[PDB]
Design a protein around this nucleic acid. Structure first.
Lengths: 147, 95, 207
RNA sequence: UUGACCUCAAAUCAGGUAGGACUACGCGCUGAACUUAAGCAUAUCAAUAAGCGCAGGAAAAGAAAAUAACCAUGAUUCCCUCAGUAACGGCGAGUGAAGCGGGAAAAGCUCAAAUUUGAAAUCUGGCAACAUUUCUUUUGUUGUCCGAGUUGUAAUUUCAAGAAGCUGCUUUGAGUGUAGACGAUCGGUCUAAGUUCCUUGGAACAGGACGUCAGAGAGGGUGAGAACCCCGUCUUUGGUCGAUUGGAUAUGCCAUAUAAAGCGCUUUCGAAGAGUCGAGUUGUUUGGGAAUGCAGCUCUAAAUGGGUGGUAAAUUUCAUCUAA
RNA sequence: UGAAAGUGAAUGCAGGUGGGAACGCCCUUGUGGCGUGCACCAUCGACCGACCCGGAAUGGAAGGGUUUGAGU
RNA sequence: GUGAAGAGUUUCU
C-alpha cells in the first residue's frame, strides 16, 4: 500500500532518489522501444537478438482449429482411465483389454515417451508416433485409428 | 472411406442419407415462359454494338479477336466465352 | 529507454483510451436485473417451460466434433419423421431451423427421438376448455412448469470400456497406414496427371 | 363550339404535415493538427478533436448471395475466449481483426415477379346515421355519392417454398358477474414502550436507581450522547379506480358455427429484383497483404446463372449461399 | 523442433566422471580413512527436432556427422 | 447524333 512505499521515506530528500546531475527529466532517450537499431542496439543485440528482420512464410487467414492436436505421452496413458478401470485391468490377466480413447481425454496425437506396463491395452487416437506404436505393440496392446 | 483423419475419403463413417431438394438451388434454370419472354425481347430490341462487332468477327472466323473483344467488353473470360457461344448459336440459327 | 530485464513493452495505449474505459461496477445489478427479468417471464408464461426444447448437434471442426451441444431448432425432415407440422411446432414450443439439414441418419434419429420424448411428456391444454380436441389432453389439472433440461439432457456419447483384441488389430500398422494414406492423398493429383498422359500420349500408337 | 384524355398552373379552396430545441447513449457525412517515430515526409495520433445532417427510449443490426472443410454449424446483438494471434507497418515507431467454443437473450417474417378475368373482389374523401372513449377532447362501423386505380388496387404464393390439379382427409370469436393476484391504491392504519426519582447543568437528551417495548436498538428533531418526548423504523389486513373473458369452469354464458387450414399417391411445373453484378482505373479506408469495404469515371452482363471458399491467371471438379 | 510440409524425446539404476549436504561403519584424534551418495557446477555420452550426408512412383526404415535448438 | 465522298470484312480524314 501507500504507507509502505518508498515515497514516504524519500520525503525530505530533494532529488527524490533520481540524482542531482541527471535528474528525472522527461523521456531522454525517446519513447517506448524506439532506437533499437541506432542507440539502443547495444541492449537489443545482447538481450533481444533476432528482433529486427523477416523470417518464414506468411499464411493469410490462419485458423488454429484444423491445426488443433494436443499430444500425450505413453507414461500417462494409464492415467486417463478411472481408478476402478486401473484396478480391474492393470497388472491382471483378462480376456478383454481396456480401451483408452485419447481423443475423448482431449488429445490428438499419442507420443512415445516413458515405459508401459506389460498388460495389453487398446489405444484409440487420430495420430500416433512410430516409437509410441512400437512400444504399445511390445506391451501387447494395439493402436486403432479414429476420426 | 478409410475412417481416418487423413486420406482422400477421410472422416468418421456414418450412415449417409439423401438430402432433400432445396428450392433455392433451383435458381439459374431456364423456364419456358422466361425463355419465351427473352426471345420476344430479342425480337423487339436488337443487339448491342459490341455484340454486333463480335458477330462480325465470328462470321470472319477471327476466333482470337472475338475472344479478346468479348473479354475486354464483358470483363472476365468466362463471361466472354459464354457470350461468344450465344452469339455463335444466333449466327448459326440465322444461317 | 529500454534498459531493464524482461520482454519488450507492447502497450496499446497511444489513443484516448481513458475516454472509453469500461467499468463493471454494475455487474451485481445486471445479474439481479436479469434474474428478476427471467423470473417475471417464468411467471408470465407459466405453466409453459422457460426454455424451449433444443436439438442435439455436433459442433463443426475437428477440435469440437467429438462433443455434443444444443442446436437452434429441429429440421423439417426431423419434424416430418416425428409427425409434427412446422406450423404447429412453433405453437407447441418446438423451434424450427430451415437452414440445418440431416446429412446422417444418426443425427436424424437422435433428434426425432428428442421430439418423441418431448411429445410424450407434453401436456397440451385444449383451446376450448372442457372440450379436448385431437392431440390435446384432459388431465391438465396437475400441469406445472418443469425444466426441459432435466427431461431431455444433452448427452455425450459413451466410450467403450473394454473389448477383445482381434488379430486384424494386432496386424494393423497405425503409423505406416497414416504415412501411406497421407502420401497417397498428397500425390493423388500427380498420379492422375500421369494416368492422363499414359492414356493420351499412348493413344498415338494407334495410327 | 363542346366534351374526353394527358401535361402544367392558381386559390387566405377542404383536411393535414415539416422546420426549432435537447445530443449522455445512436446512425452518417466532412475532417485536422499538436504528439510519437529521440530529426522527418509514409506511418502514428485517428478512420479522433472541431464542423454539418438525422432519431428513439434505446438507436443501429438482423433472419445468410453466412461460416466452414467438420460426425459439420446455422437470424441479429452483447460478454468471456480466440488474441496482442493471423496479418499490416521507412516490416522502423507502431497497428491489429475473424471462424470455432462457453454464456445472456432468443421470434420470425413481408413484398415485386402468376389471368380474379364468370365479373377491382381494393382504397381515400364528402354527406348522413349508429356506436366508442384515459376523453363531450379518443377511436371506429354502416349507407350513399364522388374520387384513386386496369400505365394494376385486392386474394393464394416469397424458394424454408408454392401454384394447377388428382386425392382421402377433419371441424369454431365475443359482451357481463363472483374467489385469488395486479398498476395504482389510501378513509391510512391495532401498527410498542418512562418523559418516574437523585446529582451536575441555563437547558438532561449526561451520570446513577428503579422499570418497559423490541418483526421496531435505521435515521432525524427537540435548550448537551434520547429505542420508550415527537416524526419516524419493523410487522401488518382492509376500503376504492382501472385491467377485471388479464387469467380460473372467468361462471350466468352473448353465439361464435357451415366454410376453412392440416398430413398424404401422382405428375405439369415452378414467374425469383440490371447501369445491377462483374471487369479496369483513380482516390480513400481496412489486419485484409498482385484492392477489405466505400466512392468517381469507362466497359458492361448471365440462367443450373451468379456470389463466396482471404496469392494474381487459365482449365476441370467440389462445398455453401441465393445479391442488386 | 523447423520457414514449412512434417516429425516428435529410456541401450543402462533415466547413464558415466570430479567436487559435493546429510547419514551409516571403523581408525584413534586426526585438516583421518570406508560406503553410498540430495542440491548445484564442470565434463564424457545417450534420446527428440532441424541441417549436412552416404542412402541400402511413393516411404526414409537401419548407418552416420566437423554441426545446430529458447529441447528429453 | 444524321447523311455524302475519299484510304491502301473494316475506322482515319
Amino acid at each position: 500500500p501507500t504507507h509502505t512505499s518508498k515515497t514516504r521515506k524519500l520525503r525530505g530528500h530533494v532529488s527524490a532518489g533520481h540524482g542531482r546531475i541527471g535528474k528525472h527529466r522527461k523521456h531522454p532517450g525517446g519513447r517506448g522501444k524506439a532506437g533499437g537499431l541506432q542507440h539502443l542496439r547495444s541492449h537489443f543485440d545482447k538481450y533481444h537478438p533476432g528482433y529486427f528482420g523477416k523470417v518464414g512464410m506468411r499464411r493469410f487467414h490462419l485458423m488454429k482449429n484444423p491445426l488443433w492436436r494436443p499430444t500425450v505421452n505413453l507414461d500417462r496413458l494409464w492415467t486417463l482411465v478411472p481408478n476402478e478401470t486401473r484396478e480391474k485391468y492393470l497388472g491382471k490377466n483378462t480376456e478383454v483389454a481396456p480401451v483408452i480413447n485419447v481423443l475423448q481425454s482431449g488429445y490428438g496425437k499419442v507420443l512415445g515417451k516413458g515405459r508401459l506396463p506389460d498388460t495389453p491395452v487398446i489405444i484409440q487416437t487420430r495420430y500416433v508416433s512410430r516409437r509410441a506404436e512400437e512400444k504399445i505393440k511390445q506391451a501387447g496392446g494395439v493402436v486403432e485409428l479414429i476420426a | 472411406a478409410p475412417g481416418l483423419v487423413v486420406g482422400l475419403n477421410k472422416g468418421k463413417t456414418l450412415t449417409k442419407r439423401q438430402l432433400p431438394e432445396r428450392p433455392s438451388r433451383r435458381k439459374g434454370h431456364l423456364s419456358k415462359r422466361t425463355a419465351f419472354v427473352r426471345s420476344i425481347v430479342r425480337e423487339v430490341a436488337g443487339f448491342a454494338p459490341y455484340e454486333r462487332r463480335v458477330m462480325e468477327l465470328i462470321r470472319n472466323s477471327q476466333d482470337k479477336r472475338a475472344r479478346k473483344l468479348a473479354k475486354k467488353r464483358l470483363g472476365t473470360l468466362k463471361r466472354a466465352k459464354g457470350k461468344i457461344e450465344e452469339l455463335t448459336s444466333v449466327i448459326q440459327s440465322s444461317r | 529507454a529500454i534498459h531493464v530485464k524482461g520482454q519488450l513493452p507492447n502497450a496499446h495505449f497511444h489513443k484516448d483510451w481513458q475516454r472509453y474505459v469500461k467499468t463493471w461496477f454494475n455487474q451485481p445489478g445486471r445479474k439481479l436485473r436479469r434474474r428478476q427479468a427471467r423470473q417475471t417471464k417464468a411467471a408470465k408464461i407459466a405453466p409453459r417451460p422457460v426454455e424451449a426444447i433444443r436439438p442435439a448437434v455436433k459442433p463443426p471442426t475437428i477440435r469440437y466434433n467429438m462433443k455434443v451441444r444444443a442446436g437452434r431448432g429441429f429440421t423439417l425432415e426431423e419434424l416430418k419423421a416425428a409427425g409434427v407440422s412446422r406450423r404447429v411446432a412453433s405453437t407447441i414450443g418446438i423451434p424450427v431451423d430451415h437452414r440445418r439439414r440431416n446429412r446422417s441418419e444418426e443425427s436424424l434419429q437422435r433428434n426425432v427421438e428428442r421430439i418423441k420424448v418431448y411429445l410424450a411428456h407434453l401436456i397440451v391444454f385444449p383451446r376450448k376448455a372442457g372440450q379436448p380436441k385431437k392431440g390435446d389432453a384432459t388431465d391438465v389439472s396437475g400441469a406445472e412448469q418443469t425444466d426441459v433440461a432435466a427431461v431431455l439432457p444433452i448427452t455425450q456419447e459413451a466410450v467403450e470400456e473394454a473389448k477383445p483384441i482381434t488379430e486384424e488389430a494386432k496386424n494393423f500398422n497405425a503409423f505406416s497406414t497414416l504415412s501411406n494414406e497421407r502420401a497417397y492423398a498428397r500425390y493423388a493429383g500427380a498420379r492422375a496427371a500421369f494416368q492422363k498422359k499414359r492414356a493420351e500420349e499412348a493413344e498415338a500408337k494407334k495410327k
